[model samples]
Target chain A: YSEQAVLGDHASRVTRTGTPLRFDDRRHLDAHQFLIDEAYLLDAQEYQTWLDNITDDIHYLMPVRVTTALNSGFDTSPGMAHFDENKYSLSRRVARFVTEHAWTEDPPSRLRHYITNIRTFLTDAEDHLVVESAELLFRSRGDVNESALVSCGREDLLRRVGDEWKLARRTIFVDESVMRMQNLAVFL
Target chain B: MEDIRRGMIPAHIYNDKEIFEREKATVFSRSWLFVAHESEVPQAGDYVVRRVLEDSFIISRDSKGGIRAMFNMCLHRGMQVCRAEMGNASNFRCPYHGWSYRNDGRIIGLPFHEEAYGGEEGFKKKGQTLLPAPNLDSYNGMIFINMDPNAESLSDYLGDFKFYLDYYTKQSESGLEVRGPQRWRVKANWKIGAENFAGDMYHTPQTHTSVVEIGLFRKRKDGATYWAGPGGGTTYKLPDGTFDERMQYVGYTAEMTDRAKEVWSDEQQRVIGADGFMISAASVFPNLSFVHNWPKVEDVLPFISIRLWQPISENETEVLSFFAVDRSAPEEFKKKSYKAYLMCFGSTGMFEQDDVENWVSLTNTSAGSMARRLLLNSRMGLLEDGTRVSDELTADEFHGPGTAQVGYNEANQRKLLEMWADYLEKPALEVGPTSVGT
Candidate 1:
């Protein structure tokens, strides 16, 4: 957002005033199905398969969380983020995982992305659907009882490409000021 | 100290609680600790609450334009007066008893003071203020606080390291403005990060191989490792190019380079132009670290990031990472510089993500009894007879201070541990401010 457009001081700017969709609507159910299936691909370590669903102009962002007083107008540290990525950077991250020396995942971690509380809205652009969901990621790696959990709210823009829903934009709002996870190696 | 000098270290220091206790008393309590940058509090009433060890401090710019580091604890009941991480405020009122304090640390209001304690007759409110840090100072806009009031001035503490510090902090006449200090926790000892940044260039080729292999960055094998005073760093040998040309080689814009040249002393320029040393990874004494690197985020451009490895426990660390660019930099360059910082270094950074995996695993192993039995050999660039692969660079060879060597070595790490050992063995300082009360 800092690169192309003016950004609002608050998270409300991520949301657009659009027509709300009912739960039973076909497009709404399709959006929910697309997320569940995407989570399956991520958990199954099918990053290549998941990459196919990403739009070329994807804007993936996870801002740095901060503890601020109520009505402080901002809770995220401006111009800083955990994941301020474009398609190129995101592709590079995925490309590294395939390399022989990518030891952070050479002994790959077990991951489960639990996504819920999904809501869908129709934007003015007929091809685009705004989907909001909450994610609780459960991850554990290498022979220990220790595990890390990260909870966040995500506002996503899904574009319909030949009847297939593709992720075009995602802005993640993490719950914790101090991230407890050892690394955000896995996609949220 | 002899063991450290011989490039051998006890693995137990990495995770032992007893050693950590000693370090807190002798090293953290007595030494200068980086809290916040001056850019964080650019105007009056702007403040950022930070922690050094167990003490919480409010680093604020008062209306009078003085930078003050006040202990965040309320004088009345020891409650924290500033609850938010950062904000602009005229005054901070305690949530416990509504005890209000002006941004200058002066107590302005005490709710129902007469009803509770008969006002001035029972308790004196006049001239009462928040307890300021025992010692506070800054270098190149980097704010640091010392618990020991009798400690040396920050400039003297930084010493010869200021020459290299100028490359990152004093790049322009306007100085640097910092962005979010992306804070996160890692299950690794704080010293490991500090030591790595101090001069562990050898780890880059192996630990960050993925970053290079992924076509994001090209490896710089022909780089020099430098140690000066309490600090040291890895540097890229520019070899050719004028002052501006050398900076341009590392993705610095012509305008930014010109500004840096204008502000920096001739000696500073000579380090880059004549000596061809471009700053890379560096650390100051105990915990503060800095890195200047150019990765192909969008266009290949250098980004400077300064971080603090705050100790959470013997085996845990809180990492506060910040991106710094010259305040006078072009808007386009600033954005690119920040992007470079994001892709390469913070918590989610491709390079940093892999680095912590190793550190975490290393720290976890240090907790075992086997670690106590084994002495880790940190000696690099040394032969069987204990001689250097390359002698320390002379003044003509390297313009910077302290020891400089071309090949990979743990000399800087050894120097850092030598200081750490010196502090570890010393008696704890009795650090406090003078009392105004009888």
Candidate 2:
């Protein structure tokens, strides 16, 4: 919360105050490798294969984005989101596409996630690793030929469920003010 | 509009440039468009940016506790005063210049008011305020703005549908609050989406066959019906198109169903009795539509999104969709409701993409010269004019407002085109003052 919890002000966590938080080089590289593996599974249409990496308690959300004078501190008031789902709902979303009847994918968009700028932090919760990254999601649905380029910022909370680095929570902030894409059926 | 009753509408209306322009000046400007919900700006200064056709609005709460829907453009260079989609701000300082305004739309200060321009009187700033919409009114916390200052009252426009609106919105004690707005663009005409939501349940079993197969949009014993108003659309239920006592509003917390009795009247309650929800939807003319959908989730509750079909071009439209839950709903219920909202309605909503597929395809195909020449059928239930809800069903089933009929009819679309024609043909001046300066 800001020093002033002023009336009408955003009730969002101060995810970042000044410079976008950065992590040590060693941690950054590990997080980079982690995101790359996750991206590969998703891009390859192996979402179910990737589900094993998320804890049953995983909370995935993508809050709406807004441009502000303070560029870093995007609020996290739970106001609205693209996907505010728990592990149960998230799995259902995955299963939806699995059934092979997902309409958005009359022919699923050939997609690739350009994940980079990996940043990880040693956090208060020694139990979890706080990771952040920037992404550009490219998708082409059916024979439309033309595809949409969606850029976004991501925040992830990862923890160890056995030897696996299970995702505990994730938040995606879409950069487009008014999304040009026909649908966000493709995960960011 | 002629072929509408027969389910045969001119395909040109979907992506016609000429009609799009007329919609801007006449239909969009004249109609009462939803701007924001009171819950979104619960506290003074909680502002959100929303659009109504060609207009961008800074919907905020004033220091005086009043709701305001002001144009987002800065007065000086015509640049936007506020760029963030939403935030709490005492004032909006334009990025283009140093001009700033209070959340209430008053011009408060400027950089170098004298040095840049002149002296104390160099700029008469008293009347230099943000342009305000002609008419701003609210119903059950839902804020609406009409460009025409003298446009008919929002209540009258809503007509008896307000009863159903109350059921949809005021079912809980604390009423409802808004979330995300979950906006995304679609390559289709604005009307394509509006008309579908207006009351197009006929397409549900077909367009959403997969959803039904996957165990979504569950039907209750009491059954459900799609409703239309003023000029509403399609539906389904008993052969007579009425609800039965067996129907219970599927997909809601029992507490919410219990909370409803405290808000609605006896008649309204009876009409919605056992039917707190199931296939509920209505279009508020021209561009605004609402759907109280309870996606088939075992423990989830019902969610309603007030959808705005903002026409961006002949072949492109931006959907500004909002979801709200009873403010007093339990935190768990709100959370689940939000999940349901994301599941069925938002850009990533499972069911929503299905409609987008159909809409974009229609616009894509109809944009061609050959496609536009064909007439589309809308005629479903208008075989003999229209049927009244009073004459159609039993007392306990559906006694609510509007001309209720079987779910298969296209009367809602017919009414929409009828009103659209009236708006396009009516003189521009006939649409009362829409903005501050007229």
Candidate 3:
């Protein structure tokens, strides 16, 4: 495998289209299960389980969305992102959550990840599949009836490592330009 | 106002409905509110939609390369002419009635003028343009707009604060280039952040302990906080003449420091060099704030974060945060600086994430009747007898401008609240003129 830079110039990484794979295909089934299983792990607050499925050369990004005239053909800001993380940086955040001083998650907000619109595609790499999914996360913390809803479109590159699939590249495009949530302490 | 002067803040101001309305008319309207950075709209016709209270504005660069802040409302039916948050366009044609406006905000076309309104008889289009902001000015590439026509000049408002603003903005001859102001909302009053940034260093050790626990920031207890005019913040404390040899430009590389030397005036350099002070987190009155910090992102390096706390209501604030870097810095340094900013300051930031958790809870609790009956003490570093724990540093002792005090104190926070009370007590037009402190 070739080394990749995960944290700079994400314009090209936003979208990478490919031929569709049949819904019943074996790899397609595995990729579908992978997403379903991953969402379960995130919702269960099993950050370590989700971290185990991440490849060493992963590019996890969520760029800032802008409201532009339709004719402009560009929506995300150039050279700017919300969560621009490489494997080490991503792991650092996970490590932080486990620390006792991470007060933001001490009470741990209850989260539910609603995953849908899964579309699997064949990539040039024999062992890789490009998957597109939509995620709507509902978060509630403490006893406050007030909660936050976050909706985003995700493009993930799932690489098959032996019997397991690992996330190699994932770009999340949030719907709202100005996020309504008090804090993005929870992952998308 | 008297209670605030005594370092006692009423809980009602934190989330009061009536107070927020008063702040809108008296505070935000008259202050020099930061709207954009010059680099965001570098080219002609580039524009960004922004808000000052209830009014929406389009901050754009005209074809003549002059910056213009025009109201987004269309004169015909009051519909927003430019709907997009930001883009480049030579002309904006309204979807409602096809009323076209040039990038300069002049009404260039009116649909079916002759047949619909008999051309210039019913509606005059000659020299008709969008309503401009009452006042617009820029300093160090930072744009600001004022809603009151009779408001003081931006320079007068900034005053001695300009000396410190250069540390974050004028790092080199080319100045700073800004990145996306990642916008997000927090269920907290805007003043909470303004006060926190103005001079709340006492909260850092407790609130952001997670950042240090994660090995991202090495904890340090010794730093001075200074208040200059409407702005104030924390700074690295050093002995006179030890800045150049000991501190390493706070976090900048030696090469970047060399460029900074060329750009900064002798007195400006003295702020860090001879004055033994280095700018860190700071906030200007009303809403604008700036931060310069070094966090362990890949490696320990510094980044500049600028933000505006745009109030949405009594209890909600729409935050717009921008990552800025010296335009002349090396490509590698710029990338790392941005990473540092993201890891430490934005919505996903380890440090900032905890701040909102505390602020949101405080705001929620303040809505109760019990909270309304209590007054919070903001007098940190004050003895029971009301004597200050530290002496004010003299010009000969501390090299920078403004009122400098070593160690932790909420004197600056009190100063901010005092000014806030001034605005809240009187309407903008009837208020006495504010002077720029020496």
Candidate 4:
């Protein structure tokens, strides 16, 4: 993939000589608004609606975070990876929700995603825009109101399909080598 | 005539407070208990805090490159000096009174040494020094401390077990090394774990039968198999459908084709047989043992670990376990061994879950008045004239002439009790005291 240059202002930047920007200002704003709304739906345990945001060809992937030697530079890619995924596999995970024996997620965990640091990139198609953003996700269980889980990761890709932005493919790179929390059931 | 039965340990021994006391005084105090290994304190100034019996101690390597065990408490007011679990330190400064001691356990500085008594007489005459363990020594790089100065040397105490240990230690040009921090915690009585991990393979098929369901162990029609010799017993089975008892134990099977040899070395094949394998584990008297065999499904064996059940109270014990791999093994092998260690023995291992659960259940149930009133019995396989004599140092002669033993036999348990009884019967000797010399 080639690097795309900057063109317009910080808030209203439009690509000049790179891949086409699928969603204009209004569409991009609507997509971001929908993203936040989806986050609320997830928090509320609206499983069906949460699942609806992704296309049938969704690829939800997350690579393991590693603590490399100090001299190894900033690149986090070690030989080991925590997660690799495809759309069919994602559907299988979702199917577990409706099944009677998804014990890990049956009661469902309370979740909150603080998505920020959005950086957008132009796509090859005029009607498709790929967005990158960093997110801090927190989860809690039981009667305790305090946050029980915190995860920091960067989301690499989001595509705008037709009028709505669907998660075509996404790779999350977390910043923790060993997970501090007990389990990783909730979306971060 | 009295009907002498085999494979039975009296139940009263488990809940006897007097017996427990005797064990603490003798077995625990006299025997060489595996303390922190040398690898933990690689540097001269490195130290790791540990507890032996009721006393908290620090195991450290001194500036002179010698390993020493000292009471974590300062001589002044008996205040704790070292707080951290493991760290590198030039000296320990008591947070309570500011009394500091060098890594060698010498009282190097006092907060007001001069002003307190108007001279050096104030602190110097006090004779404050870090209390050291009565006897401190190491075997094959594994350090141990004994509270009894008259206790036999580590080699003499180890006896036959050292031979078994030497088998693995001597395999590598460099001795076996412990990987990292030794994990420890309190659970059931020290004897329960000591006996189970050491000799009770009978519990494998029954207690951990759930493993077979999870494909961690292969199912067998016959009971657990063992070799009746000095080489040690290993469990084995035929591949899917063969029932020759002689061939089964003696390592013969059609499963040992060329493909099988490719997956396993000739030595591994010889030990495990074609479809089955052996795990080497032993109960090395008193509170320590080494478990070599985890199931094939678990695939965590080959990485040997030393376990000790440090007596915390009569009813409670602190179990310390160290995961160690051959220091000379390849990096990939070490990584695999570490992963297996994490998967099978660490705080979250699946196998250890059942062990801890049962251990807690055993102690919890025994706490009842009625339960405590009755003695715990271990009289399994009490009657079978199959005893065999062996010169193997670590091998127990009590198991008789066959390998497929059943139940938790009283023999191994009795050995520990015997040692415990001996320790308790004697007066507590003043091996050495915490004092400074002029």
Candidate 5:
């Protein structure tokens, strides 16, 4: 009985839609430009500007990718994941960048990011839109160069509380089996 | 009659199938192949997997605290018994079947022994134990395995090389310990790496010119910027920015620093003295080699690393390097010594990368049929008419003044091949006389 009610409630919620969503190309272009600008700030080693873009309650989490039978069907939760960050944890990672003893970053590795295949979806709540994007990252340290491909599945609750659209909640999912590179200190 | 000269190795030795087969039968099978260092398996039932002469083996510490070498395969169904690279276990069980073996390689159990054949008498009594290597022995905490059961003791096989080992290993009171798992894989022929490390100081400036460019090395007052000359000269710069024109070309000046003297205790200081700053490595006739040298770090004293090259094919070989510090050294000193080993050798090391590239390039060029026929030359240090020092024949008493030096010297390479030829030419009975006598 409990299972049947749960199924019926989910079905009714899915059917009860108010108006069909429409994306204005002009607004979408502006939003994409804003995203690209944020990426450039980080790529150019402007940490302060990049930090200013995020909300006060910035949350960054990344889960590990595992290998299993194809029939397993899109399972995201498995082994222990590496990075789960709150505001404090994010601050700590930024602090390591400036520390002299952080040999992994002290040499200043070269990096390039290619962001593409972006699509946006409207949410039930007003002023909120979910975004999806695919990323290809290439990195070089000294004489060694390596590349990694990651597709991002993101859920962002955007609200215009004042004049600016602030991120109220954000969750990011990455798709890659194993880390081919030696160290993962750099942000994707 | 063909003229034989020093510092020149005939090119035919690199790709000749007959020569390689002879090396395996006479040199590899007869000499002590370093199997594992004692520190890797320190406790009872602890074991590590290794290889010797194309055979997989398990080097383990028995319950009685004795070391043993066993064929890694199981007696039942010929399955490999130990699956993991290293771990502590009272027994190894074959995953294919339920046959089990004790840490010392004794067959301990079989599943359903009573139910399968109603307590089969002959089956249980049969010699179903794990197969053991022919000979297994340890010298100064370094273990060696030989396919010839009657092989000579490790000390006897080492011969003059033992004195050089003692020079570095005895510096610490407690002796040395190994760091962790050894890294190994097939690469260009084994002799290339052995000869390169042993006597190929000639390639330093050209092969590792990046180090000089990066300021890791600077020119001395005598104008000798690196260890070897273009054609394979032995002019080296001392640590004081002066050139030691009198010392042999085979030695390293980095070992003779004040920091090296201070690293050793007063007792060790007297034993090592000026020679502590210099490292001399040599390949004993066959594949076994000993490298006695200090790392780039200042506080750490010299350590000895021993390796054995098992030829996989005519042009390919598998190399295993064992890191050994003085057993009497302090725990802190041993830790630092291990860190240096990880940083300089193995797959990820900076210097090792350059050596790997050279070996690959050499193998690629020599694979051609016409190229294989060309005799590799080693004609350096041939015309030295000077007096000898410490039993080593020198061309000149003075280290510098540019004696009879050439781009390549066949002396050391010829010594290796001549020794190889002597062993191969001997009767089968004399091939491993040292093992049989032992």
Candidate 6:
């Protein structure tokens, strides 16, 4: 899936864990700040800084939300998305921001990302961390003083390359089937 | 709406609550709306969930391979009969009451079969089938439904436009296949999207100025100087930062286009190869829009997308977008096409952000009294001498169909708005309340 790396199944539907129960641990607290630091970069429109923190094989995606009946024995694998980006495409996206005519972000957005109830899970590799966190992105730009919230839960797979952590894969599941946000330009 | 004929529409028409309600009944409910592509449900029991206005439908291929569209609402307590977004299903069991429905949208089994519905005036599955759409039909594999049963057939409404539609949809003998009908909401009226796609090429130079200035669009290429960038990237820039390369490939090489010509008509070959308008974005009235942004990239798959603007309210629309490629296209081509799709049309697309910002701001400002009074203009091609029969502009003179202005014009949009006004002028109760499923 190199060419279509973002189009792969990041996770099955069972990973739709809503605010993991009993998130009281030392790793939980540490993961909270890891998520916060990432959000701060995006909120400050520091995409170049954020780009360096991702792996060359990064799989970033936001799966489309669907209204479905509970426990119907249906396949809940990664389906379609709002944003499916690989490092190559994501690089071009960030590069576009440097161009003077990129009007979409001419007057950058004012954003506040609320990340809560973070939980950390370890895979077979000791350094690999899969973190689950809920995110509510409140953002607005220009004269639109009021903001909109895009509530979502994300499943992140990170790798500890040397001492710094790098995001290898991240899957987002937005709460609303019909999003109310003005634009999907938010880097939540 | 007086200046509508001249391509200027009242701003209030976009944000007005009353007009929105009237459009639901008169425009949307009466028109033949594109729901799902035929490829979405090819085999028996294969189904996909879709919507018309506020009503959700489960469009499926029944056991016998016939198409069926159920209301998704159970006949008993209105619980949705089928649940998931899409999958191959033999039967649907309502979670609320465990009432089961067949693949063909009929009540096959009820939990209280011999008990609750036993007595006279009690229960019978006579007309107890899942409420189905009034009119459902297809044209060259694209499925459409008209809420008003007596509404004109899809072919009639499609009319001469089917020529272009076929060129776009059926350019391959194997036909096309669809993938993830990605969905999202927008803070604007459905008409904004419909009109944009129907004919808003005027916005490209300015709206996508960044794409142009950043050297994304490719220039015409015929020499050895042109080498498709690694991974078949659509546009490649040299040290000088000029886009001197193939103009339109969508992942396909020029040789591939030459061979694919066997599948296209002579007119299709000429029109599709026309400068700057390889595949024109068009909307078939009401709330459906089609886009073939097929940019050249790693693979030579054309990125064709179809979308339905679900009018959730006066100023809000939920956009349902589906991406497709020729079923016979190579895997690499499809992958490259997917990347092209990600860049241009979906929710967070680079091009999408450029367009949505304008729409959202326009809707936001129209809520004010003064702004509502102003007429939003599409008067570029609305000039007195600009209007042409399009037929007068012969195929030899013009590249594509409809009123060919031979240049940037708003004639297509004016025709759309005029048709919209014609429908909204109908009596509120004139649509629907007609025949049911066959």
Output the number of the lDDT-best candidate: 1
Best by TM-score: 1
Q: How close is candidate 3 to the true structure, as a TM-score?
A: 0.94
On the 0 to 100 scale, the lDDT of residue B179 in model 6 is 67
Better candidate by lDDT, 1 or 6: 1
TM-score to true structure, per model: 0.96, 0.84, 0.94, 0.59, 0.58, 0.84
Off by over 4 Å in 4: A1-188, B1-22, B111-115, B118-129, B167-170, B180-187, B217-279, B294-301, B384-410, B421-438
TM-score of each model's B chain?
0.96, 0.86, 0.93, 0.74, 0.74, 0.84
Clashing pairs in 6: A13-A76, B231-B298, B232-B297, B232-B298, B234-B296, B250-B295, B251-B296, B251-B300, B252-B300
Ranking by DockQ: 3, 1, 6, 2, 4, 5
Candidate 2 lDDT, tens digit per residue, B319-427? 8888877777777666566667777887777778888888888887777797667887666654445543223444445566544544355566767777777778877
Candidate 4 chain A lowest-lDDT run of ten: A1-10
Order the candidates by TM-score, highest first: 1, 3, 2, 6, 4, 5
Please give the TM-score of chain B in predicted model 3. 0.93
lDDT of 1 by residue, B227-293 (tens): 8878888898875879888888888888888888787888888889888888999999999999999
User: What stretches of model 6 exceed 4 Å from their correct place?
Assistant: A1-33, A70-79, A142-146, B94-99, B110-128, B213-215, B219-250, B253-263, B273-277, B296-301, B382-392, B399-401, B429-438
Model 2 lDDT per residue over A1-188, tens place: 12121111222232322343455565455666778998998898787888888877666767665555564265543366666666666677777777777766767678899988777765555556678889998887766548889998888876755645767767777776667888877665
Q: Point out the higher-scoring one by lDDT: 1 or 2.
A: 1
Q: Return the lDDT, model 1, position B362.
A: 88
Instruction: Provide the lDDT at A125 for model 2.
Output: 57
lDDT score of residue A71 within candidate 4:
37
What tens-digit string does per-residue lDDT give for candidate 3 at B309-339?
9999999998889989999888888888888
Candidate 2, true inter-chain contacts retained: 0.61
lDDT of 3 at B170: 88
Which digits, one per residue and each the tens of the lDDT, describe model 4 over residues B369-429?
6663554544443444545322222223122233344223444443444444455567756
lDDT tens digits, residue span B304-375, model 5 = 566676677877665555666655555555544543443344333334545665775566566667764566
Candidate 3 vs candidate 5: which has greater TM-score?
Answer: 3
Off by over 4 Å in 2: A1-32, A71-78, A119-128, A161-163, B74-79, B93-100, B110-128, B213-258, B274-279, B296-300, B382-391, B394-397, B430-438
Shift in Å, residue B85, candidate 3: 0.5
lDDT of 4 by residue, A1-188 (tens): 11110100111122223543355566456556766776787677666677777766554545434333233343332222233334433443344444423343445666787777554555555655566566777776545234554556544345556666766555566665434443444454
